[PDB]
């Protein structure tokens, strides 16, 4: 069972500033890695797949990068929509399709 | 002729000498060669034959695109003498997206599986005619060895499985006489998940080393009693484990009875055989993906699960070149039963994107008591040149 | 693709729940239909899914024997039934499409990630 | 079936009549034909087979580029009935970049050498299965005859060598019974570099005429005693010498015991055989390049080293057309053992730059007691038309 | 096994029923088929085989240009089971620009002629090995039947000729036993010029109907005595003559002993056989070019030279479609010897300038005592579509 892990657990950021969320896999997941956004009281929303392909409707300010064991989601300028919990998930070859425990993106005071 | 009994002792083995290579992908770039995967070798009294599951297409063809899927109505078991490549004159012996074959000393048995994933049929074709059939018992991809069955005194035995291949529920050993299914044993003992067995005669019984796609990176063992149909199972003790994926040799472990739980999920078809308390085995040189191929002996590695003392290593395929499935086959000599193996050399999709097809060549090695040198015998096709 | 689920549930421990998920027509031929749960501040967990064409279902190791996933093509409605409900099974249950549409018996699954999700059904497992 | 003993007398020979031609390069220009080199012919009890070392590719193929290379992991021994060209249905009998084969009266033996140049393996494959193996003893390209071995009463013999291509190489004669190496003799007597032997039964023994790559433009001889494994060696006496390069016939000389030192270095595989004190032999017509091919008898040329009296000359390939290796094979008639030979007709790189490949066709001639005329049977492909 | 003796009566013949067609030129337009000419059929105890002289090239090939020459170093005798077209897996049984073959009841004899026009060699290859050879006796294109030889009690006979085929000087009948030439008779009797004989067993002897290239448009006959090697010869009496060119049937005449001197020069290989005093024979429908093909019985036409009473006519190839050589072969039935014939269907140059090559297909007919209808079985290739 591959363990996904995310850091930091909470990322405090000023509106308009750039944010980077790290996801690390306990074994190589190639580029079989996805990212989801979840706002409070909503179902998760797919942002990235194949570590870097933006999903439909996802604005160009979201960018994914990395391969093997380490991945980044970059949000290029936080709008008020972007303050959410972000989950990474591997989909590499064989189950379980484990998720990370998620990173909260949070408004700086 | 009389039925085969394999009652001779196993040969002395110091390692494996080169025996055959088909060069199928290099020949495909300039001639009409079949797309195949999941090859194996099996021999009658006189000759060895190469088998593979065709994709119902030649490689230089419009139908060779998307040939990565393992199950379609067009897959057929191809059969040739070993070293004759799969050209258009190749016989399709039965409809099959999974199979096994063996010669009992009188005629060929083919076990051929095809149909819906949820409701597949296995046909038992013996001496060129359909003798028996059985339906999927767990309704989730009935499947078999992708290598030779073994026959002693005309009783052939084939391991078959359905569902997620769990234990007594899903894996059965079918005992077959001239194509008629005469008995069926549920899997018994401590092997939890059992697929794609590589089997060899070990008179009076049959012994199989298999793939565990869920819990083990160590390999399951099945002992099959031909006289009373009893089944026993366990795992290859060796601390050097033979599945892919697996942990690095500095950190891997094994257990004689249980799956080791180390990179347990997924696997590759492979083989091992006992040599007293030692084990001979083959594996991909890489620990996570099907690159290279090596064989070695592990000292006490059949009996002692903490042993990692390997000796007599051979590279068959260098660590930078693709491999695939591998399986044992047994050949009767003048005075002893030799063990030989084949390696599938997979090329094309998903890993190589120069081409739209997925296909294999093979290389084949036989056990020797003589001396042998070094080499590397990869597939050798240049996909940049036969590029789409 | 739209996915619409049944409303919230409260269940006694040791009982069973049967959440439903109605899809846009023909969804179960194009996508795997997958169930994923989220204990209320803990994290996402995949439970299993039912693969298109063959309709065979695949379950995460911890739920085997406890969960069943089925799908009626005709109403285009999938169902997840979870049994022997522990207090710990208190969670939001989502249905989702997975892009994965074929299990290769050798090479496993491609594209098992989740582009479309149901609104989520809260299941509470409690005595009161 | 009983073992071959070749105990019949050698046939009367007046010269050689045409017997077979494969036309492989002309057929390659519109057909899927294998790239090959180092061909040879050998016959079982009923029929003659053509053998060659494939380059693991057809000629109209992306892989046919750089097939001038002598040793690669993809070379395999091709086998067909004589006159069936090497099309895609051809059997690859073993992995080999050097080889020899023969039929003992019960089954085929193949001697197949492959691996790293500095650590090669020879596999002994008999009746379809690997029986024995041996590693490179001098770690510098283990190599064998590139022509048939010879078997008397089931004991086959093959000459093999390892070590320097232009220095004191280590030559052994292996005695083989049903594929098992039963004995091994070091080379003995006065031959000093001894390579690519062309061998023939000369009951009760075997005789070989070989290539001296170092000091002879005369050819070495080996006599092999099958019954006591003893070896003797010397050189073809005739003042007309059979290697290439060599000095012009007006200026060449020879010695019965020593290499003649005249243009000793380098060579080509060829043949000769005794006919009382006379010798029958073949050689390239050109003295410094492998062009043309002629055969003739030299009167007392087996036993007088100053004899240059040739007679019964035949041009087999005209002096302007390419040649290559050539070798004897023996055929059992009703009353006597006939001698036949083949000529490799090499085309392409390095000498022809119209094409990226190197390949051969073959022409084959047999000894006749009858009468014969004249001709020239070259390869006949037009590389300007099948030009890259 | 035992030698063939053909000591059964000739089957009652009412005409000829269709037996085989190779479709070689239509298949050549989409696959690797040999360029050929001068085909023939011959049968062993079990099966019929088709033979032809290959031009050392496939048809879709650069080497198929200028294949109109009848003699080159690259021509080989191709052999297949009848109805298997000449694909690349075809065996080249010998080097030959002229040939004949037959099976004696134990093995194949091939008579294979090749070499310089002024100094050709005939090789006699029996049971797969060269047994004998003879040189051109008059140093002007030694040549043979281009159809089956005939064997009775193991003595095969072949008609061969040299020079302009004049009488005792040029034409010889060679008697052959297991490939050894045991006797040679000069032609005797009144047949003046004798080429390309079509021969049939007529126990106790052999009878041949031949091509007169100089004086006759009537065909020569040779009777060969197998027991005492005596030769007798004459001409087909029929006023309806069988050569091409010839005079129109209203204006032709014949003679039993002499060439008729009517369009004597040039000819085509053809056949006839006796049926009591009647003669069955085949010829081109057109009188001055090789178009169409017809067979018929001429009442008393074997013995009465003024007879033109034809009956039982069959068109084999319509008068607008090309034909070529034709020849008899004999097939042993349960109780009688049947007569069959083949027709070469020549296509391409010189007459058809759509293409650069010259090649043939065949159609084959056998005698029947039953009933038959009508048809026309031409070559059928569309050279406008496979146009150069
Ligand atoms: C031409 O071809 C031939 C045939 O292919 C080539 O020979 C083959 O070479 C390979 C090299 O890989 C050999 O396999 C390797 O074997 C060794 C183990 O063998 C050595 O150790 C034995 C035990 O030694 C201990 O105990 C003795 C007392 O019993 C003590 O005296 C010692 O000090 C030790 O404590 C020993 O018995 C062996 O001796 C015999 O063999 C050699 C030849 O190999 C002869 O000289 C001897 O006379 C005698 O007959 C021998 O000394 C393994 O260590 C190898 O596996 C390791 O290495 C792999 C890479 O090569 C690696 O991938 C593996 O993971 C593994 O490495 C791990 O373990 C090691 C310690 O165990 C660590 O060092 C390492 O870091 C890592 O942690 C491998 O199995 C073949 O046996 C040999 N085959 C034959 C038949 O000879 C030849 O090389 C070629 N020649 C040329 C010109 O190219
Ligand atoms: C059709 O096909 C057939 C079969 O293929 C052809 O027949 C073959 O023809 C070639 C012709 O080159 C012959 O090969 C050559 O043979 C001669 C040797 O033979 C001749 O000399 C013999 C010796 O003569 C002396 O000694 C005897 C006593 O022993 C005395 O009686 C004499 O007086 C002399 O003193 C002699 O015995 C031979 O006679 C026999 O053969 C002929 C036919 O050839 C018959 O008429 C006779 O009746 C009798 O049966 C004969 O006269 C060799 O010398 C040749 O080698 C030289 O030439 C080569 C080129 O061909 C060259 O490359 C060599 O280096 C060599 O040349 C060197 O030596 C020469 C002097 O010795 C120098 O002049 C030269 O400069 C150089 O230094 C060659 O081996 C075949 O034997 C013959 N085979 C058969 C089966 O007949 C036929 O030609 C073809 N016909 C047509 C129309 O195409
Ligand atoms: C279906 O398939 C079958 C089988 O293929 C076809 O049948 C076959 O058809 C062809 C037609 O060409 C026949 O060949 C021809 O035979 C005639 C000779 O046969 C006729 O005359 C015989 C003799 O007649 C004289 O003597 C009798 C007494 O004995 C008198 O009564 C007469 O008056 C005469 O004086 C006679 O015996 C025959 O009878 C038998 O056959 C018929 C059926 O044909 C039956 O009714 C009878 O009962 C009996 O069984 C018969 O009447 C030849 O003349 C033909 O050659 C000429 O024609 C060619 C063109 O077709 C031409 O190219 C030749 O050059 C030649 O022409 C020249 O000669 C002529 C005179 O001979 C001149 O008139 C002409 O101007 C020119 O100078 C030809 O050989 C086959 O025999 C017949 N085969 C069988 C087994 O039946 C059938 O046609 C097909 N049907 C369909 C619908 O497709
Ligand atoms: C494989 O088969 C051999 C031969 O056995 C015979 O053929 C089989 C296909 C079955 O039809 C058998 O019923 C049949 O006997 C087996 O070897 C044989 O084993 C048996 C039992 O151990 C031996 O039988 C004994 O023989 C003596 C006389 O020699 C009698 O007095 C006894 O009453 C008893 O019948 C037999 O000697 C032995 N033969 C040989 C040549 O070994 C073999 O056991 C079997 N193995 C497996 C794994 O199936
Ligand atoms: C090749 O083989 C023959 C026959 O030898 C036998 O068969 C072979 C296939 C092998 O299996 C051999 O191991 C086996 O012995 C040899 O010829 C034979 O030589 C022997 C010894 O001189 C002859 O023995 C004599 O036989 C007579 C009666 O015939 C006795 O009175 C004598 O006391 C003595 O035993 C034997 O007759 C002879 N056979 C023939 C057919 O000639 C041959 O020497 C051998 N050659 C080589 C080069 O190996
Ligand atoms: C074809 O062959 C047969 C048999 O001839 C023999 O076997 C062959 C395979 C060859 O090896 C031949 O060389 C060998 O001779 C011939 O038939 C036989 O012909 C002879 C002579 O006419 C008959 O001999 C007579 O037999 C009677 C007793 O049966 C005696 O009274 C006579 O004195 C005389 O010996 C013989 O019976 C006969 N056999 C048969 C079965 O017919 C045949 O002549 C020959 N034909 C040709 C054209 O060559
Ligand atoms: C396994 O099968 C093999 C055969 O494939 C068995 O070996 C054979 O055993 C029989 C019976 O003992 C032998 O037959 C006898 O041979 C002698 C000598 O030729 C003959 O005179 C007798 O009349 C009889 O035919 C046979 O030769 C032998 N074959 C071999 C190659 O050894 C074997 O016994 C079987 N074993 C088991 C355990 O099933
Ligand atoms: C031409 O060859 C054929 C064979 O291909 C000869 O026919 C065969 O002749 C022999 C000897 O007369 C017959 O053998 C005998 O047959 C009986 C009954 O089977 C048997 O009991 C005797 O002991 C003996 O073997 C054979 O049956 C016969 N075959 C056929 C098919 O007729 C023929 O005689 C030869 N012709 C000439 C002229 O020699
Ligand atoms: C592999 O599957 C077996 C079989 O279980 C049945 O089929 C499954 C696909 C699913 O539908 C299950 O709910 C079915 O029970 C699993 O074995 C079951 O496991 C549980 C414990 O988890 C046990 O209590 C049940 O008795 C088992 N079922 C039967 C019929 O024996 C197994 O857990 C799966 N294992 C892996 C490695 O995937
Ligand atoms: C193969 O042999 C040649 C011939 O020289 C002999 O072999 C030498 C190893 C040594 O024993 C000499 O005394 C022998 O005469 C070798 O050619 C020599 O090459 C070296 C450079 O590599 C050069 O300095 C010498 O002068 C060369 N001698 C001659 C006579 O040419 C060659 O090196 C040998 N090849 C290999 C790979 O060993
Ligand atoms: C032997 O073969 C060589 C090589 O094919 C011939 O050498 C050529 O000779 C011509 C002049 O005659 C030169 O223009 C070429 O450059 C040479 N080629 C090479 C590669 O060197 C030689 O002529 C032949 N000799 C005989 C006697 O046949
Ligand atoms: Ca595993
Ligand atoms: Ca030399
Ligand atoms: Ca093609
Ligand atoms: Ca004429």
UniProtKB/TrEMBL annotation, chains B, D, E:
**Molecular-function GO terms, alphabetical:** exo-alpha-sialidase activity; metal ion binding
User: PTMs?
Assistant: N-glycosylated.
Q: What top-level branch of life does the organism fall under? A: Viruses
Region (Head of neuraminidase) residue ranges read 10-387
Query: Which residues are noted in the entry as substrate-binding?
Result: 37, 71, 195-196, 211, 290
Q: What's the chief localization of this chain?
A: host cell
> Membrane topology per the record?
Single-pass type II membrane protein
Q: Which UniProt keywords apply?
A: Calcium, Disulfide bond, Glycoprotein, Glycosidase, Host cell membrane, Host membrane, Hydrolase, Membrane, Metal-binding, Signal-anchor, Transmembrane, Transmembrane helix, Virion
GO biological process: what's one of them?
A: carbohydrate metabolic process
**Location of this chain's protein in the cell:** Host membrane; Virion membrane; Host apical cell membrane
Q: Which family does it belong to?
A: Belongs to the glycosyl hydrolase 34 family.
What does this chain do? Answer: Catalyzes the removal of terminal sialic acid residues from viral and cellular glycoconjugates. Cleaves off the terminal sialic acids on the glycosylated HA during virus budding to facilitate virus release. Additionally helps virus spread through the circulation by further removing sialic acids from the cell surface. These cleavages prevent self-aggregation and ensure the efficient spread of the progeny virus from cell to cell. Otherwise, infection would be limited to one round of replication.
Name of the molecule in the record: Neuraminidase
Q: Which organism is it from?
A: Influenza A virus
Please name the taxonomic classification of the source.
Viruses, Riboviria, Orthornavirae, Negarnaviricota, Polyploviricotina
What gene name is given for the protein in this entry? NA
């Amino acid at each position: 069972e591959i363990v996904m892990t995310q850091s930091p657990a909470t990322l405090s950021v000023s509106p308009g500033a750039r944010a980077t969320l790290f996801c690390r896999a306990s074994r190589s997941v190639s580029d079989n890695l996805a990212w989801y956004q979840q706002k409070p009281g909503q179902a998760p929303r797919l942002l990235i797949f194949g570590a870097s392909t933006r999903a439909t409707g996802v604005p160009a300010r979201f960018s994914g990068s990395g391969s093997g064991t380490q991945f980044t989601l970059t949000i290029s300028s936080l709008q008020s929509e972007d303050f959410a919990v972000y989950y990474c998930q591997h989909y590499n070859i064989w189950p379980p399709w484990t998720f990370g425990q998620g990173t909260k993106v949070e408004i700086k005071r | 002729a009389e039925y085969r009994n394999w009652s001779k002792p196993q040969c002395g083995i110091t390692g494996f000498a080169p025996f055959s290579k088909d060069n199928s992908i290099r020949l495909s770039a300039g001639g009409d060669i079949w797309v195949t995967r999941e090859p194996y070798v099996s021999c009658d009294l006189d000759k060895c034959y190469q088998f593979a599951l065709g994709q119902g297409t030649t490689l230089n063809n419009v139908h060779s695109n998307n040939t990565v899927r393992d199950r379609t109505p067009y897959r057929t078991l191809l059969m040739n003498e070993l070293g004759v490549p799969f050209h258009l004159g190749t016989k399709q012996v039965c409809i099959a997206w999974s199979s096994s074959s063996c010669h009992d000393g009188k005629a060929w048995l083919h076990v051929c599986i095809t149909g819906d994933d949820k409701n597949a049929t296995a046909s038992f074709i013996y001496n060129g005619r359909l003798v028996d059939s059985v339906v999927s018992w767990s309704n989730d991809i009935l499947r078999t060895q992708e290598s030779e069955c073994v026959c002693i005194n005309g009783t052939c035995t084939v391991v078959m499985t359905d569902g997620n291949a769990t234990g007594k529920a899903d894996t059965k050993i079918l005992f077959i006489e001239e194509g008629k299914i005469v008995h069926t044993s549920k899997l018994s003992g401590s092997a939890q998940h059992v697929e794609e067995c590589s089997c060899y005669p070990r008179y009076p019984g049959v012994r199989c080393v298999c793939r565990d796609n869920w819990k083990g990176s160590n390999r399951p063992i099945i002992d099959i009693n031909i006289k009373d149909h009893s089944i026993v199972s366990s795992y290859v003790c060796s601390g050097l484990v033979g599945d892919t994926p697996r942990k690095s040799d500095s950190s891997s472990s094994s257990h004689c009875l249980n799956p080791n739980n180390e990179e347990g999920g997924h696997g590759v078809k492979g083989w091992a055989f006992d040599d007293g308390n030692d084990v001979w085995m083959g594996r991909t040189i890489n620990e996570t993906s099907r690159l290279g191929y090596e064989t070695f002996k592990v000292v006490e590695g059949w009996s002692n699960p903490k042993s990692k003392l390997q000796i007599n290593r051979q590279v068959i395929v260098d660590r930078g070149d693709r491999s695939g499935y591998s399986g044992i086959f047994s050949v009767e000599g003048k005075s002893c039963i030799n063990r030989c193996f084949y390696v599938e050399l997979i090329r094309g999709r998903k890993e190589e994107t120069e081409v739209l097809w997925t296909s294999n060549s093979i290389v084949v090695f036989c056990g020797t008591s003589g001396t042998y040198g070094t080499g590397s015998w990869p597939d050798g096709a240049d996909l940049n040149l036969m590029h789409t | 693709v739209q996915l619409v689920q049944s409303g919230a549930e409260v269940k006694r421990p040791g009982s069973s729940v049967r959440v439903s998920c109605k899809a846009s027509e023909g969804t179960f031929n194009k996508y795997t239909l997958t169930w994923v749960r989220q204990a209320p501040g803990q994290g996402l967990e995949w439970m299993g899914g039912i693969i298109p064409i063959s309709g065979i279902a695949n379950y995460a190791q911890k739920f085997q024997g406890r969960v069943a996933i089925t799908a009626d093509e005709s109403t285009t409605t999938a169902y997840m039934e979870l049994s022997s409900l522990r207090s710990e099974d208190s969670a939001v249950y989502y249905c989702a499409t997975a892009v994965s549409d074929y299990f290769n018996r050798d090479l496993g699954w491609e594209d098992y990630y989740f582009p479309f999700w149901g609104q989520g059904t809260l299941v509470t497992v409690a005595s009161a």
